[PDB]
Design a protein around this nucleic acid. Structure first.
Ligand code: 2TM
Ligand code: MG
Ligand code: ZN
Lengths: 1340, 615
DNA sequence: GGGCTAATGACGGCGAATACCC
RNA sequence: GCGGAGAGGUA
DNA sequence: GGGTATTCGCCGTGTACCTCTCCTAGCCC
């Protein structure tokens, strides 16, 4: 085991051996943005692709080309932490190499001039942190992956609602990644219509017309010909027998001398077989049969030239006669089988008004840009750029792959632009499916839904910036002169940086990290949103869309999704799933070699999964990959059933791969109803870090994966030995193995102490390790918020008892014992940030001085001379948070008053105070203060203290590193000095600085001393410049917004204890409000005298079918019972032997388990340490579906000497009498959710009112009243309550004179009223009157 | 845009204002409360009643001027809290819960100052509010003027609203803990401590139970004196020896005089308690019903706590014969599938056969489980054994109607039946495992789909409901009861709707509280049974039951003759109160609300078969 | 900073405005 | 610093 | 021309509450 694992091992249930280990959980974001930057030669995914797509930018036929060489990412000026501190965006400057080339128009293309620009700067691009987030203005943002329809072609049905007479009308939609959309649809009259992206529906053939195809060419390409020969008389037809399938006979079908089908009897299969075996090709046919068909080609009179019948004209006897007399021997008709093969292109051609190419382009232009007269070349260019311009229309590699796969072409790699064959094949497939030789696609299939991660979306936005700047540069290069300008006046960075910061900051998919819990962060980063750009709106989306499709298996979590209005549109991604090369979703599976289940894993996407029969992970395999059962349970086409052993192609990797991380953390998921599991996961993501997080007694084993993969822990990069431990930094001396040969030094990890998270919670790291302990790469040095020794501790595990306790746990409410507040276990630290900004007004700049007009010295007492609160001062609502003064101008004081001002010291400049005050009703301690000045602003005292505090630390760190390197260099100088005449008595006792001034015999040794002296000088000079750089960064004004002189931020930290009304929850979907704090004595207690902590209502179990909490309680009681026994055996300190025996018998516990804990490592110390950590209760790991069965829980309870049934007899702490029917007690892992009553609670008597409609403000920040809505009005009307409603409508909110008169009347001790007319009604009159509508209040 | 639309105007600022003297907070249990009161945090109460505080402070002379009163409130000295207690005394406050579906979403209570930041809500009223203590919040308004105070305490107070305005039945019925406690109290057991001893009354029954000399449920002979108002409002004591449980006696202590003992004598589940409250209301009246409901709550909570009912993994018993049933059904499905591969039955027919056999197997396992769980306590009397309705905690939770239905019991201990795939088609293999056992990926996945679809349904359902109820309350708002009697003879002949097999809804409930259009005659002419328009109260309905009236013509609101409103008689009585409608009541809005609010849970014929022997 | 100028993923219902069929 | 968008969450 | 379909376009789509960022913009003097 690893060292952090050897510290405290977690007893893992679970029978099947894990073949694949959980991947890096944040793989999506990091890998996508890495792919985004990724300097790579061949243009694949990556910024490179965008540049080559948009560049080269050629003038409007001006012969001045612009070429792109390569780009470089500058080194970020600000690291992540400091960037968050200073409130700037963490980003990298982007520099691109360009060349301007100017040629000669009048000569064969040849470069006259080429100038190469010194890596022109084209704006800033934000970088992603190591953990996968973005700092955009000193706030951590996450870019959630987006689920959306993949480019390609889709054939939908849209039935049921078509005129309510059946008539299922099909449609083919071609959707590109970039470019306009194409749509082919039908109509009630089976005419197939095309509709450019979202316009009116035109006859489809026009696009075919636009493609330069003549009517005969089209009818050739689509319909199967039928030949009518005339030989010596009367119309003989070439017939393919198999074509007759299912056709009532219209004529007498005679052949080879014998009538086969009588005229009128429908062709039966017997007749079809007869004709097929006879090999009948041609038969003479009566003219009545042809009297109905349609003509394919446009048969002209070849002799004279006059046209007779046109292409796709219905045939009449007279036309047949004219054809026969004209001399046409071969007639090509159409095959219109009203059952299978319909006249669809024919009828579309009939409705199609356009004839020529030009008329088609004109109709197209009048569709795209209605109203402006179309000019020929405008239409030509429009149509060219629509679907065939490389720049505007690009499907993708993915789009093309899906397109070719849908139309059954072997070739995967195509051209981006929509070629004509593509469109023709699409229409062919549409009419094919319309005949019934094909299936429609289901949008909800994950094989049709693609995931756009960060890098892809960033690339799109960056391309958008490029298209902006390209148009701009285009115009500037066309109009302006060619040779004068150098390649930096020409290129503007503003649109690129504008687009990028717009996307990252103000976008639907770019959202705040839900950052109060490690689970919250990790789950937020691995999210798949169906909203955002080109995404369905949540309100519009139907219930059918938001359901969970069988394809989601092992790719998206079926159970973790917000239960709010956008249910089903969020879908957190499952544990093991990945994104394909093309952006699809794939899950690992184990290969099956016909008999043996091998160990090589293949990742399969949705479509590939669809074909095969996949076995489940929880299938019994014995020692050689063989199934124990003859018929095993699998799924083949989205439906599960039983298949034979020698049929399974793959098998699930592990039970967890179905569910997300959040759901994977819930123990005994297999016993919880899906609804309550859903709510449990969603809530569990809201837990707030407590003061000392400990661990779940009942976990799933995934805790370490989540904690490590989240960035909240501090993890070693190069393994070594812990040299120095402090509650701010851990300094480790590297091991020689991992030690770099040249310029290695040691590793130093600076920790972060209480800072503000997005949700205002505290983010503090504690050290785990001690001095002198060896650490390896990837161990957990320091615990982040709500994590312990590497494990996820979302909340805390307490002893609960399921029983109704005098209806104080009546509904989902929860009862809690005073011991819980006494032990200080649900107290969280929160942290508010406040900002006072001093800008520069034109009447004069505001000041931060402590001299504030007409404030008592009481308010200043807690302020320093600079005017900022002291760090550590306790404040309350209304106290002055920071001092600011508002300037006063045009004072125009009287001359005697001016003389009075001079003696008194009164300041005409002040007289008004803009000082920030602590908000009403919030009280805490000021833990930190920051000050940001712009250029030309003097540093305040606070600025000096904060700068010195950061600097002295930096100095210390540099000094420590330098001192180690100096000690090494001095040791080496001593090792050379010992050679060439040993001197050890005098040397070691004189100071070290008296070693450079000493000398030695002139030799090579003196040359080495000179070498080392110059190396010493070089280390000094590098140290000094690095120091200077650090000092320049510390001192510099931290660039503020235009107009702002300086800003002062103050952090308050507040310790919130649990109190009645707060919301508490479990992991299984059980919720509640803490209703009462009971004294310790009142709480139930078992015979032994230990009281319970929470008394939980049983009635929440049967109707809310979450049984996982009951098993969790039982197993948790078992684990805490064993832990209690080990604490008891340990307090008496029996001997190592007993402890090792007991712990081994516990860790083994039966068989078939994949644990294997030898306990051999470190015979004495490490075992004693591990016992010390388990004395508080041995942590279990039940995986989600490969969990602990009841019998195992019974065994574990027995090992602890506890009742096997998991229920105990309890004594009523108030009365002392026993409860009948023993009750379930045991430890369950409960969470305190972020919904704290003190944040929710709110009341107002009178306060500020709104501007336009003089009603009181809405909200909690500003006092704000409750909204007496229309439903409440109706409630009052249902009663006869006229006066209450009246006052509620006028005196309470809207009537100004009424409200003040009522205040005065109430104060007077009288209770009457004077309702008047609401001001909002008068506003209404004024607004309606602002239209041309006269609305008057009449009188008579 | 500013005028039209929800967010803009009329809806937002002219029917949806934002009052003063209002607050919001999380709701909490507070069992000790009276039906007509609510726990209110000190600090919100002070904030709300600020101007009252100033007025009273100035009247008492504690403050010279209003600013000194403000400063005294901002320090919050003991005098301020004393004045707040004194002013709060009879002042009622309005409690509201975010989705005010019907008029019981707003009710008035007398506040009691408490510590904490959460509002305490009386348990019995939660059903009216649809309130749950899992983070639900409530708003609290203060009526200012004297008419508003009187209106809040009279029309809106919790105790004045015990009957639903939609139908006449009680709204405040005990919900889950109360009913569980009462159920535990009344159920009897074959043998316990103190079997068959004779008690002189309930008081010594309590003496015995609280001292541990008798079980809370144990069959016993007790002498009891019930009261009956058989005469013209006088109570006559009848005193005899009944065979009951200790628990039933303990419960009888609360019951007011007028009620028959029989009421408590039974198992006393949800329905039994509800009809208990019903009879108490119909016989005695409002105030005794209120006090009796409070007593019921207290005793139920207390004895539920004394019961110690919990839920262990073993409380849900896997039927012993499950594995056999499942293996048999699997063999049968295998035979039918093989007999399909040979081609004697279509695919659809095979589907139907499998689905029906699986449904039958599900019913078999369910019935086996119910037999196992239901009556499994084979406990012994003095000698031989006997069997009885078990005391399995989950079973008591099922049968009492506190939580859970038979379906969920099935879902815990049996096989959890068939599921529907997205399109509505039913999967061939069911989920044989249950939550006591563990499902595997497929069965879970399927149930996940089910729950997901359910949730999305509830969301869209709520939106549609809200819209429908808005239209209803909107259309019928102006209708008011303006006249006492229009005097028309028109009316609708109302019959009981007997859809096919039996009487889905009887006459008595359909006609109760409607005035008659004309006198109806016995089956023999000139035998008038009901004078011209009379309100048909319970007594008339029972009288009609004694006779054999089948169809009754009653005056309806639709045919009412009154101009610009309706008349009291054409409408009838039905209300949260019992009496004929009062002139002035806005019946349109009450009707619209009553039709709208419940709208959130809304989603062969070869031979005729006579059900009962008749002509 | 100051001065000057200004696209594509709902759906149902209903009633009016053409399209067309005798 | 009254407002309105976007995102998320609660019942 | 007159009645009937069909396209077409507008109008609606639950309440109460709680967090956060972001808010006129671009070019020239
Ligand atoms: N989208 C939403 C979701 C919820 N709500 C509100 O949350 C409650 C749902 O209760 P409910 O009946 O659905 C669950 P509960 O009452 O606790 O009983 P149970 O758990 O034993 O089944 C209702 O008051 C709804 O108004 C809403 O307004 N809009
Ligand atoms: Mg609730
Ligand atoms: Zn009437």
């Amino acid at each position: 085991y690893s060292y952090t694992e050897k510290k405290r091992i977690r007893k893992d249930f679970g029978k099947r051996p894990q073949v694949l280990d959980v991947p890096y959980l944040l793989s999506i974001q990091l890998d996508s943005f890495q792919k985004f930057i990724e300097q790579d030669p061949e243009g694949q995914y990556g910024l490179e692709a965008a540049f080559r797509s948009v560049f080269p930018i050629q003038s409007y036929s001006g012969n001045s080309e612009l070429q792109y060489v390569s780009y470089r990412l500058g080194e970020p000026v600000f690291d992540v932490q400091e960037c968050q501190i200073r409130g700037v965006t963490y980003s990298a400057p982007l520099r691109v190499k360009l060349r301007l080339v100017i040629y000669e128009r009048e000569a064969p293309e040849g470069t006259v001039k080429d100038i190469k620009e010194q890596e022109v700067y084209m704006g800033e691009i934000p970088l992603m942190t190591d953990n996968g987030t973005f700092v955009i203005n000193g706030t951590e943002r996450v870019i959630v992956s987006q689920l959306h329809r993949s480019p390609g072609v889709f054939f939908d049905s849209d039935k049921g609602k078509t005129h309510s007479s059946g008539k299922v009308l099909y449609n083919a939609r071609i959707i590109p990644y970039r470019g306009s959309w194409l749509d082919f649809e039908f109509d009630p009259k089976d005419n197939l219509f095309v509709r450019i992206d979202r316009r009116r529906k035109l006859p489809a053939t026009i696009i075919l017309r636009a493609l330069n195809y003549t009517t005969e060419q089209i009818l050739d390409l689509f319909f199967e010909k039928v030949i009518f020969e005339i030989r010596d008389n009367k119309l003989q037809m070439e017939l393919v027998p198999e074509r007759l399938r299912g056709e009532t006979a219209s004529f007498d079908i005679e052949a080879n001398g014998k009538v086969y089908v009588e005229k009128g009897r429908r062709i039966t299969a017997r007749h079809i077989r007869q004709l097929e075996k006879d090999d009948v090709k041609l038969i003479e046919v009566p003219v009545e049969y042809i009297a109905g068909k349609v003509v394919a080609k446009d048969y002209i009179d070849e002799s004279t030239g006059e046209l007779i019948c046109a292409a796709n004209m219905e045939l009449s006897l007279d036309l047949l006669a004219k054809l026969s007399q004209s001399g046409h021997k071969r007639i090509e008709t159409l095959f219109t089988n009203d059952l299978d093969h319909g006249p669809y292109i024919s009828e579309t051609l009939r409705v199609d008004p356009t004839n020529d190419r030009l008329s088609a382009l004109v109709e197209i232009y009048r569709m795209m840009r209605p109203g402006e007269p179309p000019t020929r070349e405008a239409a030509e260019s429009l149509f060219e750029n629509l679907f065939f311009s490389e720049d505007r229309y690009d499907l993708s590699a993915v789009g093309r792959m899906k397109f070719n796969r849908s139309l059954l072409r072997e070739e995967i790699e195509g051209s981006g632009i929509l070629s004509k064959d593509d469109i023709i094949d699409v229409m062919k497939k549409l009419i094919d499916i319309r005949n019934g030789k094909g299936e429609v696609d289901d949008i909800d299939h994950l094989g049709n839904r693609r995931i756009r991660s960060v890098g892809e979306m960033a690339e799109n936005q960056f391309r958008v910036g490029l298209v902006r700047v390209e148009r701009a540069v285009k115009e500037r290069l066309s109009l302006g002169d060619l040779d004068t300008l150098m390649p930096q006046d020409m290129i503007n960075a503003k649109p690129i940086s504008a687009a990028v910061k717009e996307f990252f900051g103000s976008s639907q998919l770019s959202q705040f990290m839900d950052q109060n819990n490690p689970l919250s962060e990790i789950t937020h980063k691995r999210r798949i949103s169906a909203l955002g750009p080109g995404g369905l709106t949540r309100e519009r989306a139907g219930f059918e869309v938001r359901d969970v499709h069988p394809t989601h298996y092992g790719r998206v979590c079926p159970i973790e999704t917000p239960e709010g209005p956008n249910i089903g549109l969020i879908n957190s991604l499952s544990v093991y799933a990945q994104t394909n090369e093309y952006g699809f979703l794939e899950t690992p599976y184990r290969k099956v070699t016909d008999g043996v289940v091998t160990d090589e894993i293949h990742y399969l996407s949705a479509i590939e999964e669809g074909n095969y029969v996949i076995a489940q992970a929880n299938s019994n395999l014995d020692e050689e990959g063989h199934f124990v059962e003859d018929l095993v349970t699998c799924r083949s086409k989205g439906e599960s059933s039983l298949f034979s052993r020698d049929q399974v192609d793959y098998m699930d990797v592990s039970t967890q791969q179905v569910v997300s991380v959040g759901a994977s953390l819930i123990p005994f998921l297999e016993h919880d109803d899906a609804n309550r599991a859903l709510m449990g996961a969603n809530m569990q993501r809201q837990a707030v870090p407590t003061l000392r997080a400990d661990k779940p007694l009942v976990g799933t084993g995934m805790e370490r994966a989540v904690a490590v993969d989240s960035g909240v822990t501090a993890v070693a990069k190069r393994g070594g030995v812990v040299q120095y431990v402090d509650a701010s930094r851990i300094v480790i001396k590297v091991n020689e193995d991992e030690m770099y040969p040249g310029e290695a030094g040691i590793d130093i990890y600076n920790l972060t102490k209480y800072t503000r998270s997005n949700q205002n919670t505290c983010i503090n790291q504690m050290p785990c390790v001690s001095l002198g302990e060896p650490v390896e790469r990837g161990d957990v040095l320091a615990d982040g918020p709500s994590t312990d020794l590497g494990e996820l501790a979302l909340g805390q595990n307490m002893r609960v008892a399921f029983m109704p306790w005098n209806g104080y746990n009546f509904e989902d409410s929860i009862l809690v014992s005073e011991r819980v507040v006494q032990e200080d276990r649900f107290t969280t630290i929160h942290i508010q940030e406040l900002a006072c900004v001093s800008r520069d007004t034109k009447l004069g700049p505001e000041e931060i001085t402590a001299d504030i007009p007409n404030v008592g010295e009481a308010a200043l007492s807690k302020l320093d001379e600079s005017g900022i609160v002291y760090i550590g001062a306790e404040v309350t609502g209304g106290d002055i948070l920071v001092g600011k003064v508002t300037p006063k101008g045009e004072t125009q004081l009287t001359p005697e008053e001016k003389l009075l001002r001079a003696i008194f010291g009164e300041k005409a400049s002040d007289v008004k105070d803009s000082s920030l005050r602590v908000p009403n009703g919030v009280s805490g301690t000021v833990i930190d203060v920051q000050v940001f000045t712009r250029d030309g602003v003097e540093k305040d005292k606070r600025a000096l203290e904060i700068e010195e505090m950061q600097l002295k630390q930096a100095k210390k760190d540099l000094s420590e590193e330098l001192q180690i390197l100096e000690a090494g260099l001095f040791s080496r100088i001593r090792a050379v000095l010992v050679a060439g005449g040993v001197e050890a008595e005098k040397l070691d006792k004189l100071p070290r600085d008296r070693w450079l001034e000493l000398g030695l015999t002139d030799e090579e040794k003196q040359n080495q001393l000179e070498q080392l002296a110059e190396q010493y000088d070089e280390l000094k000079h590098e140290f000094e410049k690095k120091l200077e750089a650090k000092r320049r960064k510390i001192t510099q004004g931290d660039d503020l917004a235009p107009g702002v002189l300086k800003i002062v931020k103050v952090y308050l930290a507040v310790k919130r204890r649990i109190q009645p009304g707060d919301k508490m929850a479990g992991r299984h979907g059980n919720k509640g409000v803490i209703s009462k704090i009971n004294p310790i004595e009142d709480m139930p207690y078992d015979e032994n005298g230990t009281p319970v902590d929470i008394v939980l209502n049983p009635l929440g179990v049967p109707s809310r079918m979450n049984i996982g909490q009951i098993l969790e309680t039982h197993l948790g009681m078992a684990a805490k019972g064993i832990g209690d026994k080990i604490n008891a055996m340990l307090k008496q300190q029996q001997e190592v032997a007993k402890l090792r025996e007991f712990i081994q018998r516990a860790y083994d516990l039966g068989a078939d388990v994949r644990q294997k804990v030898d306990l051999s490592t470190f015979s004495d110390e490490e075992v004693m340490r591990l016992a010390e950590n388990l004395r508080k209760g041995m942590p279990i790991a039940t995986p989600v579906f490969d969990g602990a069965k009841e019998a195992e829980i019974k065994e574990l309870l027995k090992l602890g000497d506890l009742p096997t049934s998991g229920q105990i007899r309890l004594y009523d702490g108030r009365t002392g009498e026993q409860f009948e029917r023993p009750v379930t007690v045991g430890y369950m892992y409960m969470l305190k959710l972020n919904h704290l009553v003190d944040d929710k609670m709110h009341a107002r008597s009178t306060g500020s009112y709104s501007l336009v409609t003089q009603q009181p403000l809405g909200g909690k920040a500003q006092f704000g009243g409750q909204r007496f809505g229309e439903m409440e009005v109706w409630a009052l009307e249902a009663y006869g309550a006229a006066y209450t409603l009246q006052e509620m409508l006028t005196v309470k909110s809207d009537d100004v004179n009424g409200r003040t008169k009522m205040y005065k009347n109430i104060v007077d001790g009288n209770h009457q009223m004077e309702p008047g007319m609401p001001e909002s009604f008068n506003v209404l009159l004024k607004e309606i009157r602002s239209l041309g509508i006269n609305i008057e209040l009449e009188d008579e | 845009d500013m005028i039209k639309g929800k967010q803009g105007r009329f809806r937002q600022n002219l029917l949806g204002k934002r009052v003063d003297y209002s607050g919001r907070s999380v709701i909490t249990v507070g069992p000790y409360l009276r039906l007509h009161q609510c726990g209110l945090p000190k600090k919100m109460a002070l904030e709300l009643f600020k101007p009252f505080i100033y007025g009273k402070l100035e009247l008492r002379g504690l403050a010279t001027t209003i600013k000194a009163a403000k400063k005294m409130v901002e320090r919050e000295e003991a005098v301020v809290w004393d004045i707040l207690d004194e002013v709060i005394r009879e002042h009622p406050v309005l409690l509201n819960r975010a989705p005010t579906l019907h008029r019981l979403g707003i009710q008035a209570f007398e506040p009691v100052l408490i510590e904490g930041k959460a509002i305490q809500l009386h348990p019995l009223v939660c059903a009216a509010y649809n309130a749950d203590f899992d983070g639900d919040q409530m708003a609290v308004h203060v009526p200012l003027t004297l008419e508003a105070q009187l209106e809040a305490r009279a029309l809106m107070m919790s105790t004045n609203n015990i009957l639903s305005p939609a139908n006449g039945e009680p709204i405040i019925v005990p919900s889950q803990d109360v009913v569980l406690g009462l159920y535990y109290m009344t159920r009897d057991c074959v043998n316990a401590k103190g079997e068959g001893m004779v008690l002189t009354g309930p008081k010594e029954a309590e003496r015995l139970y609280r001292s541990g000399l008798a079980s809370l449920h144990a069959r016993v002979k007790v002498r009891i004196t019930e009261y009956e108002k058989d005469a013209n409002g006088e109570l006559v004591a009848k005193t005899s020896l009944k065979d009951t449980t200790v628990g039933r006696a303990i419960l009888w202590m609360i019951v007011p005089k007028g009620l028959p003992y029989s009421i408590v004598n039974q198992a006393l589940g949800k329905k039994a308690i509800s009809k208990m409250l019903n009879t108490c209301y119909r016989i005695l009246g409002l105030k005794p019903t209120v006090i009796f409901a409070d007593q019921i709550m207290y005793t139920g909570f207390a004895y539920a706590a004394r019961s110690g009912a919990s839920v262990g993994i073993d409380d849900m018993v896997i039927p012993e014969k499950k594995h056999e049933i499942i293996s048999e059904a699997e063999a049968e499905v295998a035979e039918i599938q093989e007999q399909f591969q040979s081609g004697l039955v279509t695919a659809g027919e095979r589907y139907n056969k499998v689905i029906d056999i699986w449904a039958a197997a599900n019913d078999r396992v369910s019935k086996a489980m119910m037999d196992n769980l239901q009556t499994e306590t084979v406990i012994n009397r003095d000698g031989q054994e006997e069997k009885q309705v078990s005391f399995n905690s989950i079973y008591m939770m099922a049968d009492s109607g506190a939580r859970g239905s038979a379906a969920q019991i099935r879902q815990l201990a049996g096989m959890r039946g068939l599921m529907a795939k997205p399109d509505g088609s039913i999967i061939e293999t069911p989920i044989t495992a249950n939550f006591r056992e563990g499902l595997n990926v497929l069965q879970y996945f399927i149930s996940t789909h089910g729950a997901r679809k359910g949730l999305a349904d509830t969301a869209l359902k709520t939106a549609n409901s809200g819209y429908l109820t808005r239209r209803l309350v909107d259309v019928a708002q102006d209708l008011v009861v303006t006249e006492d009697d229009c005097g028309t003879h028109e009316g609708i002949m109302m019959t009981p709707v007997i859809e096919g097999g039996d009487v889905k809804e009887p006459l008595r409930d359909r006609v109760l509280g409607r005035v008659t259009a004309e006198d109806v005659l016995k089956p023999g002419t000139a035998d008038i049974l009901v004078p011209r328009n009379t309100l048909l109260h319970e007594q008339w309905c029972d009288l009609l039951e004694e006779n054999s009236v089948d169809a009754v013509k009653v005056r309806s609101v639709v045919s009412c003759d009154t101009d610009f409103g309706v008349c009291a008689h054409c409408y009838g009585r039905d209300l949260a109160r019992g009496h004929i409608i009062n002139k002035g009541e806005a019946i349109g809005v009450i009707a619209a609300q009553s039709i709208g609010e419940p709208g959130t849970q809304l989603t062969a014929e070869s031979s005729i078969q006579v059900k009962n022997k008749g002509s």
